[PDB]
Amino acid sequence: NWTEIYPGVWKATVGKPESYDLLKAAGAQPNKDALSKTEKVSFPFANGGVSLEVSGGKTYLRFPLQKEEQLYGFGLNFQTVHQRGKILELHVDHYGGKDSGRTHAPTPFYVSSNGYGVFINSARYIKVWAGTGVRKDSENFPTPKDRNTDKTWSSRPYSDAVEILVPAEGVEVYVFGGPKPIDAVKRYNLLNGGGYLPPRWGLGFTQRVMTRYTDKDVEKEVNDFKEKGYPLDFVGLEPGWQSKAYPGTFSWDKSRYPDPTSFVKKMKDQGIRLNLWINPYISPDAPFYKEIKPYTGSHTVWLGLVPDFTMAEARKPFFNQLLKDQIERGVSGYKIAEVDGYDYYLWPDAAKFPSGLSAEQMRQTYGLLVQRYSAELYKQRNERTFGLVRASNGGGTSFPYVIYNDYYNHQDFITALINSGFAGVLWTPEVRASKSGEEWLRRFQSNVFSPMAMINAWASGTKPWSYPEVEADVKKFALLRMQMMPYWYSAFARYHFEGMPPFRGMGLEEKEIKDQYMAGDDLLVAPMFAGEKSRKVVLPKGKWYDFYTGEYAGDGEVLDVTPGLDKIPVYVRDGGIVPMMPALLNSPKSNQKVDLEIRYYGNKPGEFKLYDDDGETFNYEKGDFSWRTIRVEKDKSGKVKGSISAAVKGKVNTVGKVTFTAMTK
Amino acid sequence: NWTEIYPGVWKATVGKPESYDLLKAAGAQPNKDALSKTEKVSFPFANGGVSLEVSGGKTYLRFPLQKEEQLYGFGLNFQTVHQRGKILELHVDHYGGKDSGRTHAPTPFYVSSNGYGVFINSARYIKVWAGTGVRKDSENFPTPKDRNTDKTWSSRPYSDAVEILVPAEGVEVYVFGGPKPIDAVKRYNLLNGGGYLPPRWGLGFTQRVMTRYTDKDVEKEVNDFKEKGYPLDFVGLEPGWQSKAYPGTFSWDKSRYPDPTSFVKKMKDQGIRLNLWINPYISPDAPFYKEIKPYTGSHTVWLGLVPDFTMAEARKPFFNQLLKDQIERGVSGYKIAEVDGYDYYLWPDAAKFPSGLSAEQMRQTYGLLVQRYSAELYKQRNERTFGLVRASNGGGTSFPYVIYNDYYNHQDFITALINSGFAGVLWTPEVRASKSGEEWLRRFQSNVFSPMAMINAWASGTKPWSYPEVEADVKKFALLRMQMMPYWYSAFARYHFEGMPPFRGMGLEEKEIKDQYMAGDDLLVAPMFAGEKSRKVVLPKGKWYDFYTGEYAGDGEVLDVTPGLDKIPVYVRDGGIVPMMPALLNSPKSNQKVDLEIRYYGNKPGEFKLYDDDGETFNYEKGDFSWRTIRVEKDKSGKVKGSISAAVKGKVNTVGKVTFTAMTK
């Protein structure tokens, strides 16, 4: 039966749940304070139709559906957003080109258009029939028809329930109330701890360089960024930083990085952080190999041992090496690769791990484990991190990682960004290479309207400026990313404090749209793809304004837009506010005041809550942060009038001179 | 541990096997006599490396591989024949366009090129890693390499074992000795009971007619066959024979079939048998609906109830209706459709059945159940049947059904025919429609070199003669099918008595070839596909002769062949014999003597065992059958010399005048 454990959050324990699951894997702590401030709402299933049973070694769940209902979620899908009528097996994997449930974060959480959500807290592979079963004893059992004579016969008759099968003798289930879909997602994310509060530097530009780069090659590339006037906060090092890779030594290569301490410091003195590639698979030449070997699984991945990170005996040596050899030299973070799949790379489900944990549960949670324990090392030092990971799951909302992959279809990259908001994880549609300048720019445009602005040149060697046809426009979008930092930072603060995903699908205000997303509270983004001169944009009710010119765009209608190569279609809600700092090339330091220009759109009076703190430590946990309320409207004459609430005694204040701009003439 | 239960057959019971499995589902009885006559051979795993364990609710199996080894089988695959390096989940389904283990007969049986086989007797979904796992404690653990510096680094390092995971607390496993791959397949098939011994009429031509045909429409089509001089033994009726379909009444429609008894008799008096389409899903208008309803599952398929055929209470009413309303009127057999998938048509794994059997095991065996109990009704009447089914599995070798599907890629249709020989089931690459006469003929050509010569015109309304460009050649191939009846019948006798699959891949004498198959003992078939003027044919060592002209073709070499539209490339082994009866339009009756022309190929002295019995009852089980030994060679002058062994006192003898022809001038 259902215990209301928080406002709008109910928990049921069915049968005998397993001792390991997603929340336990992640060590996810609920944000009780934030949850306590959400509305009491009533239980979303008010008219029965809920069934929870254990039989033949499995847990059978059924949740009812109404005729109107559409469903969202079930993880990081790339080709679909509406989930009703889909059949899935949720299974961590590298994305394979179709939506089957095999994906980087196959989060067992779904949301209904009626404003509720359901989370199945199991680390097993989970089967989902999202309204396909037609039960003989249903209250909505359609009348049988004779296909021989009746042209209305249906090959897929009406189904009135979500059915879920968990291969275990019980399970914990959570249900989240509304009243809106976004309310259920926020409560889910808060139950997970809220999103990570990223460092400001994490929201700047990152360049990953070719595998083979030496320390000298990186220093030169850094100098070229500076010389050309492009932003850069952190550089990604790829497998060549290690003395061996696939499998790895987790130790700096002596020929390419002869003096790691000096290198890391030189970069940091120029404002440049480093983010290091790893996969967690262990070389016989790693310095902790012999120590860790008894605490690794039966099967290897690219001839590397697989640590059982549920065991302290594997974690201590692995994470001590990261700490001592890298983090204590100044390394800012990691890119955790190849913790997803494919099945022919990773260990089989037939593998055995020394803790006794099934290879299945290990597969479902390995990404979560590496995120968890790596993030801890930074938190212990009162320092934020921000990096990349190729696998996550339910339980992972609070971790400082963005999902990326080795797939590349641009349309599908945007669809995954939409679905990230339903999945309790972050996703970046990264830029690598391109056949044309046009495609390079379209990809860069969408990428700067995402969790992480990044070119990953591991194989391509490209730089922002590598395509001369679009060079000037790429630079503009790179500088825009920096100017928007206060907007993004505030959105990420909402993710942390309120559970509000910073990127999400349409229809999520507080037919399927697979190619538009909200970015923060105020911006509707509708990317162009290479080869297109124009697209349609579906605007929600309420008035919207062009991001660039401030001019009225529309209201609850469809636009045909021909933006040009130099613009990504972006629209701002009436009264929407985007605070802009100067076009700095490096994120500003905690002791640095920064001017803001408050760009105000439309005519409805606007209100924006600007988040402010030191941008890099966990001092915010002790209360050292502020929300500055910004209000803007136009007076009788049509002239802009703005205010900002007063700085708070004793708190960090990085807000400099504030000016206001009415974008809508 | 391993009990030698028959010559070259070993059984191990690991843990606690489930009470239901594939062999029990099928009620498969071993052919002990035939098995007792195979060679004692030694256990195929002589040097350890075999592991059988139960852990965490699952059964983990590992079987070693050597460097040389290639693997075949794992069911009815459509795009692959070599299985080493593949990962599969064996799951009954309609084929979905790729080889994942989801297919009509996902037989959990594999064969090695080293001459052994392994069968996993579980009715669960079974996961297979066929040499992809790389174990840290392997005796062949490759040396780790540094991908940063070593260009020989492998993304898929060497794997030395087949690994299998069964989701249950134990399992029965069978191992089959050699010394050749074909020996292991034969023993597997014999353990299943051997193949069904089909009626001769089952090897004739069958036409399935459009869904809507009335009794009068069928009588006319029959008259057109006769008038045009095309063969026909049985007509397929499609869903319109029932008063309702999807779901079904299992009762003759009163408007389209007003007098069933008279109709069936009229057809039978003209030599024409009937084969009726069913799916097993029950209409509220079926006459046994109320009786059967408590013995049906929770979920419906196209609004039809799903009988639990493991319960006598479901079988009795269902099969009594078939018996009384159809079989006792003269109906010869059935086409059992839609017992495979897709997942969105069939019941979810979350469904519940009144016997308590998991929906999973029901999914894996439903085809087997319908085959089993329907075949029984015929056997009880001392009458053979022969029909079609869209799902089978391990345990199904002995049933009188051929697999077909609703897919159509021709290349893949031939690949499935190859893989049928590894899977213990029969498959027909059926003909339906085509965009060109060329394609129609190429499809008809391969189809008459298969288990069932059939056009399925359920939607297309086509007849053999519907494409005028190729009409004359289709007729020739239809008549050839009849003339070859003694060849096919004898091959099917070998399937029954010896386990020898009548259609099989290359290299199976007693790189991957996906487009040639052996048909009987003597014929190598290499189909053309539409759009091709020529193809390569890979001939095994030993001499081969052109089927049509008898001329030497080659020996252990590759040919480039341009056969023309009018020929399918077929080659005959040196000394090969094809007995030919006259081009009859209807299969000959049990009391009818038939002349044979013995077509003898090459110069090596040949020997052929001609099977003979009444062709339609189970009297053969009481010993009323003969094998007539035919020997042929050319004398000194190069003139043919032949013999046939003497007819056996008291036995059926349908052999008339016998003449001999040396095809190789």
Tab-separated table of C-alpha atoms in Angstrom, chain B residues 190-427:
chain	number	residue	atom	x	y	z
B	190	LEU	CA	16.070	-38.238	-33.854
B	191	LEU	CA	15.926	-37.265	-30.190
B	192	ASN	CA	12.956	-35.170	-31.247
B	193	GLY	CA	11.298	-38.179	-32.957
B	194	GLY	CA	12.720	-37.652	-36.444
B	195	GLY	CA	10.979	-35.459	-39.018
B	196	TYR	CA	7.330	-36.124	-39.889
B	197	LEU	CA	6.793	-38.563	-42.726
B	198	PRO	CA	4.590	-36.415	-44.987
B	199	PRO	CA	1.815	-37.670	-47.209
B	200	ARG	CA	2.758	-37.725	-50.903
B	201	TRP	CA	-0.027	-35.216	-51.526
B	202	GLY	CA	1.739	-32.823	-49.192
B	203	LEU	CA	4.642	-32.708	-51.691
B	204	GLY	CA	2.376	-31.616	-54.601
B	205	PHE	CA	1.295	-28.130	-55.482
B	206	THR	CA	-0.812	-25.965	-53.207
B	207	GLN	CA	-2.693	-22.805	-54.131
B	208	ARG	CA	-4.060	-20.555	-51.359
B	209	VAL	CA	-6.894	-18.374	-52.666
B	210	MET	CA	-8.121	-14.880	-51.699
B	211	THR	CA	-9.687	-14.338	-48.276
B	212	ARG	CA	-13.129	-13.635	-49.752
B	213	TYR	CA	-13.439	-16.694	-52.050
B	214	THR	CA	-16.712	-18.591	-51.877
B	215	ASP	CA	-17.123	-22.317	-52.399
B	216	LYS	CA	-18.075	-21.528	-56.011
B	217	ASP	CA	-14.971	-19.379	-56.494
B	218	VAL	CA	-12.786	-22.308	-55.317
B	219	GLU	CA	-14.534	-24.783	-57.644
B	220	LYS	CA	-13.928	-22.482	-60.568
B	221	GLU	CA	-10.245	-22.035	-59.682
B	222	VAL	CA	-9.890	-25.802	-59.443
B	223	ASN	CA	-11.474	-26.164	-62.884
B	224	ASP	CA	-9.067	-23.570	-64.277
B	225	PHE	CA	-6.088	-25.546	-62.913
B	226	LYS	CA	-7.380	-28.667	-64.600
B	227	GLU	CA	-8.280	-26.892	-67.891
B	228	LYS	CA	-4.834	-25.223	-68.109
B	229	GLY	CA	-2.958	-28.423	-67.180
B	230	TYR	CA	-1.332	-27.194	-63.971
B	231	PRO	CA	-0.794	-29.508	-60.988
B	232	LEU	CA	-2.796	-29.129	-57.786
B	233	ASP	CA	-3.134	-31.371	-54.725
B	234	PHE	CA	-4.449	-28.995	-52.092
B	235	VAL	CA	-6.159	-25.652	-51.857
B	236	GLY	CA	-5.640	-23.241	-48.959
B	237	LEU	CA	-8.671	-21.434	-47.588
B	238	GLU	CA	-7.996	-18.127	-45.883
B	239	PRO	CA	-9.968	-16.373	-43.119
B	240	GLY	CA	-13.238	-16.042	-45.111
B	241	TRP	CA	-14.041	-19.752	-44.583
B	242	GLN	CA	-14.986	-18.873	-40.990
B	243	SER	CA	-18.233	-17.099	-40.061
B	244	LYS	CA	-16.017	-14.669	-38.175
B	245	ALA	CA	-12.221	-14.155	-38.131
B	246	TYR	CA	-9.847	-12.183	-35.893
B	247	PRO	CA	-11.221	-13.526	-33.654
B	248	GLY	CA	-12.527	-16.798	-35.011
B	249	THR	CA	-15.596	-18.979	-34.739
B	250	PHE	CA	-13.933	-22.102	-36.148
B	251	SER	CA	-17.176	-22.695	-37.964
B	252	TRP	CA	-17.971	-22.507	-41.689
B	253	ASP	CA	-19.454	-19.256	-42.938
B	254	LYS	CA	-23.025	-19.896	-44.057
B	255	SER	CA	-23.026	-17.438	-46.951
B	256	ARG	CA	-19.628	-18.305	-48.513
B	257	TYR	CA	-19.715	-22.025	-47.613
B	258	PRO	CA	-23.448	-22.912	-47.361
B	259	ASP	CA	-22.859	-26.686	-47.641
B	260	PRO	CA	-19.409	-27.556	-46.147
B	261	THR	CA	-19.842	-31.318	-46.325
B	262	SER	CA	-20.810	-31.268	-49.978
B	263	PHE	CA	-18.046	-28.766	-50.836
B	264	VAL	CA	-15.252	-30.740	-49.160
B	265	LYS	CA	-16.449	-33.945	-50.826
B	266	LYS	CA	-16.719	-32.398	-54.296
B	267	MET	CA	-13.135	-31.167	-54.036
B	268	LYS	CA	-11.853	-34.467	-52.716
B	269	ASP	CA	-13.645	-36.323	-55.572
B	270	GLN	CA	-11.618	-34.159	-57.969
B	271	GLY	CA	-8.319	-35.062	-56.225
B	272	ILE	CA	-8.308	-31.758	-54.282
B	273	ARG	CA	-7.639	-31.547	-50.521
B	274	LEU	CA	-8.323	-28.458	-48.376
B	275	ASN	CA	-6.055	-26.731	-45.870
B	276	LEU	CA	-7.754	-24.218	-43.570
B	277	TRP	CA	-6.328	-21.037	-42.088
B	278	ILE	CA	-6.754	-20.525	-38.369
B	279	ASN	CA	-5.349	-18.400	-35.676
B	280	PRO	CA	-6.252	-19.863	-32.257
B	281	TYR	CA	-7.977	-16.771	-30.901
B	282	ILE	CA	-11.603	-17.236	-29.861
B	283	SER	CA	-14.675	-15.189	-30.859
B	284	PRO	CA	-17.653	-14.713	-28.502
B	285	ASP	CA	-19.580	-16.334	-31.364
B	286	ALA	CA	-17.568	-19.530	-31.419
B	287	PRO	CA	-19.822	-22.399	-30.326
B	288	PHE	CA	-17.478	-23.448	-27.489
B	289	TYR	CA	-16.742	-19.917	-26.262
B	290	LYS	CA	-18.499	-20.140	-22.900
B	291	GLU	CA	-17.086	-23.550	-22.199
B	292	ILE	CA	-13.489	-22.506	-22.983
B	293	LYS	CA	-13.475	-19.013	-21.482
B	294	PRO	CA	-12.311	-19.959	-17.955
B	295	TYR	CA	-9.349	-21.813	-19.540
B	296	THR	CA	-8.035	-18.776	-21.472
B	297	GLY	CA	-5.351	-16.208	-20.535
B	298	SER	CA	-5.785	-12.680	-19.100
B	299	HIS	CA	-4.926	-10.948	-22.428
B	300	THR	CA	-6.468	-11.177	-25.891
B	301	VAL	CA	-5.012	-11.173	-29.412
B	302	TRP	CA	-7.102	-9.093	-31.794
B	303	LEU	CA	-9.932	-9.268	-29.234
B	304	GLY	CA	-9.837	-13.088	-29.179
B	305	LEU	CA	-9.377	-15.184	-26.090
B	306	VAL	CA	-6.128	-17.183	-25.901
B	307	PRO	CA	-6.676	-20.783	-24.856
B	308	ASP	CA	-4.257	-22.311	-22.388
B	309	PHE	CA	-3.524	-25.410	-24.406
B	310	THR	CA	-1.548	-26.947	-21.532
B	311	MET	CA	-4.990	-27.560	-19.903
B	312	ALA	CA	-7.200	-30.506	-21.045
B	313	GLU	CA	-10.190	-28.181	-20.408
B	314	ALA	CA	-9.133	-25.821	-23.193
B	315	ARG	CA	-7.957	-28.512	-25.622
B	316	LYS	CA	-11.089	-30.652	-25.482
B	317	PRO	CA	-13.533	-27.993	-26.751
B	318	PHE	CA	-11.108	-26.354	-29.194
B	319	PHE	CA	-9.930	-29.542	-30.863
B	320	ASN	CA	-13.352	-31.218	-30.702
B	321	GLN	CA	-14.677	-28.363	-32.847
B	322	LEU	CA	-11.932	-28.796	-35.428
B	323	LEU	CA	-12.517	-32.565	-35.452
B	324	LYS	CA	-16.306	-32.532	-35.725
B	325	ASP	CA	-16.852	-29.531	-37.943
B	326	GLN	CA	-13.872	-29.879	-40.330
B	327	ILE	CA	-11.667	-32.972	-40.079
B	328	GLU	CA	-14.678	-35.328	-40.087
B	329	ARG	CA	-15.934	-33.566	-43.262
B	330	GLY	CA	-12.650	-34.377	-45.061
B	331	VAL	CA	-10.484	-31.286	-44.317
B	332	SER	CA	-6.879	-32.388	-44.812
B	333	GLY	CA	-5.037	-29.906	-42.610
B	334	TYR	CA	-4.431	-26.420	-41.252
B	335	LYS	CA	-2.400	-23.222	-41.554
B	336	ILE	CA	-1.659	-22.076	-38.043
B	337	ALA	CA	-1.106	-18.332	-38.222
B	338	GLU	CA	-0.102	-15.614	-35.785
B	339	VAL	CA	1.266	-17.797	-32.995
B	340	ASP	CA	4.590	-15.889	-33.146
B	341	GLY	CA	4.282	-12.091	-32.839
B	342	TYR	CA	4.805	-9.181	-33.032
B	343	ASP	CA	4.870	-8.217	-29.303
B	344	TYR	CA	2.193	-5.599	-29.951
B	345	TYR	CA	-0.163	-8.222	-31.379
B	346	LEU	CA	0.397	-11.145	-29.062
B	347	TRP	CA	-0.053	-11.165	-25.303
B	348	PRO	CA	2.546	-9.351	-23.188
B	349	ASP	CA	4.900	-11.331	-21.006
B	350	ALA	CA	2.867	-9.669	-18.176
B	351	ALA	CA	-0.136	-11.805	-19.069
B	352	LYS	CA	-1.355	-14.618	-16.836
B	353	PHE	CA	-2.575	-18.071	-17.825
B	354	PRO	CA	-4.951	-20.269	-15.781
B	355	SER	CA	-2.578	-23.259	-15.661
B	356	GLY	CA	-0.029	-21.021	-13.923
B	357	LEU	CA	2.417	-21.365	-16.858
B	358	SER	CA	4.366	-18.129	-17.412
B	359	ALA	CA	3.286	-16.094	-20.436
B	360	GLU	CA	6.976	-16.373	-21.518
B	361	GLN	CA	6.957	-20.165	-21.687
B	362	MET	CA	3.539	-19.955	-23.381
B	363	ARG	CA	4.970	-17.572	-25.991
B	364	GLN	CA	7.945	-19.902	-26.594
B	365	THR	CA	5.771	-22.993	-27.052
B	366	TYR	CA	2.332	-21.937	-28.294
B	367	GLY	CA	3.162	-22.975	-31.860
B	368	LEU	CA	4.443	-26.300	-30.643
B	369	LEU	CA	1.167	-26.863	-28.713
B	370	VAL	CA	-1.118	-26.177	-31.617
B	371	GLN	CA	0.997	-28.364	-33.905
B	372	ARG	CA	1.050	-31.170	-31.371
B	373	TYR	CA	-2.647	-31.428	-30.625
B	374	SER	CA	-3.890	-30.801	-34.124
B	375	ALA	CA	-1.537	-33.461	-35.545
B	376	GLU	CA	-2.859	-35.923	-32.946
B	377	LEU	CA	-6.414	-35.661	-34.336
B	378	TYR	CA	-5.158	-36.947	-37.682
B	379	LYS	CA	-2.979	-39.647	-36.243
B	380	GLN	CA	-5.938	-40.953	-34.208
B	381	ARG	CA	-7.716	-41.467	-37.575
B	382	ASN	CA	-4.762	-43.269	-39.198
B	383	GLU	CA	-4.401	-40.283	-41.627
B	384	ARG	CA	-1.354	-38.145	-42.323
B	385	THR	CA	-1.644	-34.356	-42.433
B	386	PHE	CA	0.644	-31.634	-43.744
B	387	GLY	CA	0.252	-27.918	-43.210
B	388	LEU	CA	1.747	-24.613	-42.190
B	389	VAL	CA	2.655	-22.867	-38.975
B	390	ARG	CA	4.112	-19.474	-38.150
B	391	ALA	CA	5.929	-20.501	-34.931
B	392	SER	CA	7.865	-23.499	-33.693
B	393	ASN	CA	10.872	-24.321	-31.519
B	394	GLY	CA	13.148	-27.070	-30.253
B	395	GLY	CA	10.992	-30.136	-29.714
B	396	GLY	CA	9.122	-29.580	-32.985
B	397	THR	CA	11.052	-31.681	-35.478
B	398	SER	CA	8.418	-34.442	-35.652
B	399	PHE	CA	5.404	-32.273	-36.473
B	400	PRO	CA	3.670	-32.172	-39.859
B	401	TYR	CA	4.122	-28.415	-40.383
B	402	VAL	CA	6.196	-26.112	-42.530
B	403	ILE	CA	7.071	-22.600	-41.339
B	404	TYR	CA	6.167	-19.627	-43.526
B	405	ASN	CA	5.905	-15.894	-42.799
B	406	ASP	CA	4.648	-12.500	-43.954
B	407	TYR	CA	8.180	-11.164	-44.662
B	408	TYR	CA	9.361	-11.374	-48.286
B	409	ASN	CA	13.012	-10.516	-49.036
B	410	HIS	CA	13.985	-13.335	-51.434
B	411	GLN	CA	17.678	-13.544	-50.450
B	412	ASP	CA	16.684	-13.813	-46.794
B	413	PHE	CA	14.031	-16.440	-47.723
B	414	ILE	CA	16.857	-18.634	-49.069
B	415	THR	CA	19.050	-17.978	-46.038
B	416	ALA	CA	16.180	-19.145	-43.785
B	417	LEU	CA	15.891	-22.298	-45.905
B	418	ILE	CA	19.603	-22.996	-45.250
B	419	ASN	CA	19.204	-22.366	-41.525
B	420	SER	CA	16.107	-24.581	-41.333
B	421	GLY	CA	18.495	-27.578	-41.656
B	422	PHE	CA	20.309	-26.428	-38.490
B	423	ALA	CA	17.080	-25.682	-36.578
B	424	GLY	CA	15.076	-28.925	-36.611
B	425	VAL	CA	12.164	-27.385	-38.528
B	426	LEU	CA	10.949	-27.022	-42.077
B	427	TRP	CA	10.648	-23.672	-43.924
